[PDB]
Design a protein around this nucleic acid. Sequence first.
RNA 1: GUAUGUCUAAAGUUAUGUGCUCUUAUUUACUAACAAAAUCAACAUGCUAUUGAAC
RNA 2: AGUGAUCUAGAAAG
RNA 3: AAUCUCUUUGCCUUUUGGCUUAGAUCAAGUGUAGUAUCUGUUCUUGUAACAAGACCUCAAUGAGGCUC
Lengths: 54, 74, 58, 49, 129
Amino acid sequence: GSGDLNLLKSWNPKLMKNRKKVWETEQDLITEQQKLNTRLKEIEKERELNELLN
Amino acid sequence: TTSHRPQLEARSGAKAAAYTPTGIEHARLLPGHTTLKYRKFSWRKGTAFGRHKGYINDMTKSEYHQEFLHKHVR
Amino acid sequence: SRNVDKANSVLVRFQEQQAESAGGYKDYSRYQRPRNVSKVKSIKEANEWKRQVSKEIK
Amino acid sequence: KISLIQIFRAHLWQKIHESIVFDICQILDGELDVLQIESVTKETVHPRK
Amino acid sequence: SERKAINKYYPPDYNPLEAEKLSRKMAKKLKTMNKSHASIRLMTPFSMRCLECNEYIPKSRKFNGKKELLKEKYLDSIKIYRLTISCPRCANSIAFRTDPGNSDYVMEVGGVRNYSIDETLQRLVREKE
RNA sequence: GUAUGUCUAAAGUUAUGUGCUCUUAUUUACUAACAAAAUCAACAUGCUAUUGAAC
RNA sequence: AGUGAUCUAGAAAG
RNA sequence: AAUCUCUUUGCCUUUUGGCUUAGAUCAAGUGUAGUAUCUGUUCUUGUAACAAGACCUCAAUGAGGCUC
Ligand SMILES: [Mg+2]
Ligand SMILES: [Mg+2]
Ligand SMILES: [Zn+2]
C-alpha cells in the first residue's frame, strides 16, 4: 500500500463522487438561472415596448 | 538509520541458566520414543552447407544452469 | 475510528449515566466545567470542580 | 451485518412493530360497536418484544 | 473480543429509545463531543512552504490534522472544510481549505503552495455557453 | 487492520534553619495497515464542399 | 432398451 | 603550578553499525473490508390603637453573666 491516502477521505474534492455531487448541484442551479435570464430578458423587452409606445 | 543494526555479540545462554523453569508444558516435550535402542555388542546436392560440401565448481556456468535458463526463460 | 468516538458511543454514555445514578460515580474530566460558580450547591462537587481547575493550571 | 444494520438503523424494527400495532388498534377502534367490543387496549409491552 | 464482533451486551433493563434520549441530554455537556474540530490523518495535497521558518513540505507527506466544517457553503449547498496541519520543524500551524467549485484546494494560513454566489452562477452560465 | 507516547486526579503538609419536537442519512462521518494484472461487449449496414462595398 | 459409483461445509490474528 | 610553542612523521583520537523482490513504488473514476453516529425543532391595599465580637470559671469547652 503506497497510494494517495486522500482518495479514501470523504472530504477530498478531487474525488469523482464529490466532483459528481458538485456538478449535479451546479446543473440544477444553472438550469434555474437560464430560465431566470430568459424571463428577465422578456421583462427588459416589455419595458422597451412600453417606452416605444410612450 | 539506527534501529537497524548488525549483531555484534550473540546473547549468552549463561543468562537463561540463571533462573528456574516456569512449568509450561510444551507439546514437543511430551513423552515420546521413551526407550533407547542399543547396539549388538541428387536432391542432397542443392544446398550450400550439406556434408556433400564434465562438472565444474561454478554453479552459474554449469550445463544444468544453462539448460534451466533455456527451459524457464523464453 | 478512534478512542474519542468509541468513548462517546451511546452504550458508554448510558453506562456513565447509570453509574452516576446507581453509585454516584462521575469522572468530572469528561464534562465541561460550569462557567458561573454560584449555580453549584454541594461543597463536595464544587471542591471537585476546584480540583479540575487545579490540574488544568498545572 | 453492516448492510442490514444500515437498513434497520435507528431502531426501525421496533418502529415497524409499533406502527403496525397502532394501525391495527386504531382500525379496531373504528369497528368497536360493529364487533361488540367493550374495550381495545394497546399493551405496554417490554421493549425487546 | 474480535474486531468483527456481531453482538454487544445490553443490560436487561436497557431500553434503546430511552438510552438514546438520556445520552442526547448527556452529549450537550461532554467536552470532546463539543470541541470545534475533528482530528484526522491526511496527506499533504500539494508541495507547500512554511512561512515562519521557510521549511519545504512535499506533497503526499502524512500528517495528523484538524478538520473544521465552515459556516460558508459553495453555492449555499456544498460543504467546505478547513484542513489544518502543523509544521514539522517549528510546530507552527499551517491551514488550507477545500475549493469545491474548482474541485481543488486553496491556501489559508501559515504556508504558501509551490508550482459572490450570484457572480458564480453568472460565470457558470457563461461557462456552459 | 482502525497506531502509539507523555501528563494529572494526588495528599491537604513528616518535626530544624423535567419539557416540547424534525428525521425518505438532514452524519463535520471516521480508518487504510488490506487489494489493484485488464481488453470480448463494444464501435451503424453503405463519407462530406456555396455568395462583393464603390468608382 | 435402462443395474449401480454423489468432493465440499469456519473462526481468529496479520 | 613549573617551562612553553610550531612544523614533519607515527597514532584516527565525535573518522559510514544487518537482511530481501536495487525490499517495493513515483500510482490508480479507486476498489475492498471494518467501526460509529444521526442530524434538527427547542424549554421551565390605606388609616388608627396596642406590645416587644470581647472578658471571667472549670478544662478534649461548653454551660452560665439585672454583663457591654
Ligand atoms: Mg503494517
Ligand atoms: Mg502489523
Ligand atoms: Zn515552520
